[PDB]
Amino acid sequence: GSHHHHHHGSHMDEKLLKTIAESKYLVALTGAGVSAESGIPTFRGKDGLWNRYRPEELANPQAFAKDPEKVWKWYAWRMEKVFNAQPNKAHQAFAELERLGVLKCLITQNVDDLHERAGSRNVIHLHGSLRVVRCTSCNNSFEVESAPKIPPLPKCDKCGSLLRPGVVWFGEMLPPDVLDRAMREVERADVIIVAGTSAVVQPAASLPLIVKQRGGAIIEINPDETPLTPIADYSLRGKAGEVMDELVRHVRKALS
Amino acid sequence: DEKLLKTIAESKYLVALTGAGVSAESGIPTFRGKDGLWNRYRPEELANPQAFAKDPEKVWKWYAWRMEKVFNAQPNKAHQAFAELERLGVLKCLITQNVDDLHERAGSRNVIHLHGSLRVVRCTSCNNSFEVESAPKIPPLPKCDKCGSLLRPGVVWFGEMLPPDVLDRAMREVERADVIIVAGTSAVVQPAASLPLIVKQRGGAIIEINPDETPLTPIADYSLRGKAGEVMDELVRHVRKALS
Ligand SMILES: NC(=O)c1ccc[n+]([C@@H]2O[C@H](COP(=O)([O-])OP(=O)(O)OC[C@H]3O[C@@H](n4cnc5c(N)ncnc54)[C@H](O)[C@@H]3O)[C@@H](O)[C@H]2O)c1
Ligand SMILES: NC(=O)c1ccc[n+]([C@@H]2O[C@H](COP(=O)([O-])OP(=O)(O)OC[C@H]3O[C@@H](n4cnc5c(N)ncnc54)[C@H](O)[C@@H]3O)[C@@H](O)[C@H]2O)c1
Ligand SMILES: [Zn+2]
C-alpha cells in the first residue's frame, strides 16, 4: 500500500548488471508485450479483428464449441500475422543472452514463435503455440508453415474430427509436462527477468513468486507497473526492445 | 483378357489395394517371414508395440534400415501404372497396406495409407508428428525436439487400431467401387484382406495381380500370375489404347 511501499531500482545501474552477470541460474518469463514491437499488438481487451469481443470470449473452449468457424477465423488471422512478423530487438536480446550462457531457460506465455525464430533454443510454451494445430478428439498433433484458409474447417486426417489451435485456453488445464518443467526451472532460478507481461493471468503470474521465496531476484521490464512490481527488486519502465537491447550490450561487455 | 481389359475400361468406379509386392521391383523385398536385416525374426516380432517398449533401439534400427532403403528407392512400373490409371480417370482411389511412399512419389493423388507411413515420425509422449527426408542414424534413440521424449515410426503395428477416419474412408471406397485391382498382397493380413470381399458382395469384380495364389484367388474374377510391374504396365497401355 501507500503505507507499505516497497522500493525497487529503476535503472540500468551497476548492481543490476552485476546481478544478471553474476547469476548462477537466470531464467525469463515473457508476456505479449515482448512481441508488440514485432507488429503483434497486445489486445488491450479487444479481439483486434471484429473488435467487439474481449480476447477471452474467443480463446475459450465453450466459444470454440459454439462457433468453431469464428474462433478459427480469429486464429487464422492471428497465425498469418505472427508467421509474417519478425523477431524484434527483445527476442534477439533474449536469444543472445542464452547464447552467452547466462539465460538458462525462457518460459513464455506467448503463442507466437518469435523467441524460436530469434534463435532461442530453450523455450517453454506455457500456453501452447500458434504453430501447432491439434485434434479436438484424438491425440494427433502437428506444426504448420502457414495459416489455414477457413472457408472449410480443418479436419483431422486420423479421426475425421475438428482440428483446433494448439494453444491453452482459459478453462483448460496446462499440459502437465509443460507445467512441471516450468516449475522446476523457477525452483532452480536465482534470478528471473519478467518482461512484457501484465502479471495477472495465472499460474504464470505466480512463477516469479517462487524465485522470490527461494531468495532469488526479480527483474521486471514493463512500461506499466503491475501486481508484480511491489515485489520486484528492479522494475524498468520501458519497452522490452530498447531495454533488453541496452541490457544485453552491457552484460556482453562486462561478461568479457 | 479382352473381357478383363473391358471390365477395367468400362468400370464406373475402380479402386485398388496394394501390398508389399508392388514395391518389390523397386528394390524393396517382401519379407517372407524374415526381417531381412538380421534374418532372425518374423517381421511381426519387430513391428510390435511390446517389442518397441522392450527394446526401442532394436526396433528403431530395423526401421532406420527400412527407411534408408525406401527413401533411396525409385517408384517402379506398377506405381507409375497406377498413377497413370488415375490420370486417365479410371482409378478413383488407391488403398495401400505399404508404409513406403512410392505411390504418391509416382504421382498418385488419392492414396489411403491403411498402415501409416515410414515418412512419418511422431513423439510417443507429446504426440507431435512430422515427416522426414532422411533416415536416422541410431547411435542414439531418436528424440522429440519439443519435449525430448522418444520418437517412434508413424506406422500402425499389429495390436494397434488403424486411424478410424482412415479405416472409415477405405470402407466407403470399397462399398462404392464396382471393380478392384488387388496387387502385391498375400491377402492374409486383416482388415485389408477383407476389403475386396465388400466389393464382391456388392456385385463388383476383383482383379488379382500376384505371382502366387492367395486366399483371395477363389473369389477373384481375374487372377494374373505375374509381377505387378510388368502386368500393370501392359494393362495400363491397353486401357489407354482402348480409351484412345
Ligand atoms: N492480451 C490479452 O488481451 C489477453 C486477453 C485475455 C486472455 N489473455 C491471456 O493472458 C495471458 C497473459 O498475457 P500477457 O500478460 O502476456 O499480455 P497482456 O496483454 O495482458 O499484457 C502485456 C503487457 O506488456 C506490456 N507492454 C506493452 N508494450 C510493451 C513493450 N514494448 N515492451 C514490454 N512490455 C510491453 C503491457 O503494459 C502489459 O503489461 C496470455 O498469454 C493470454 O493467454 C490475453
Ligand atoms: N511382409 C511381411 O512379412 C509382413 C509380416 C507380418 C506383418 N506384415 C504386415 O502385413 C501387411 C500386408 O503385407 P502384404 O500382403 O502387402 O505383404 P506380404 O509380404 O505378406 O505379401 C506380398 C505379396 O506380393 C506378392 N509379390 C511378390 N513380388 C511381387 C511382384 N513383383 N508383383 C506383385 N506381387 C508380388 C507375393 O507373392 C505376396 O502375395 C503389411 O502392410 C505389414 O503391415 C507384413
Ligand atoms: Zn483426430
Ligand SMILES: [Zn+2]
Ligand atoms: Zn514430444
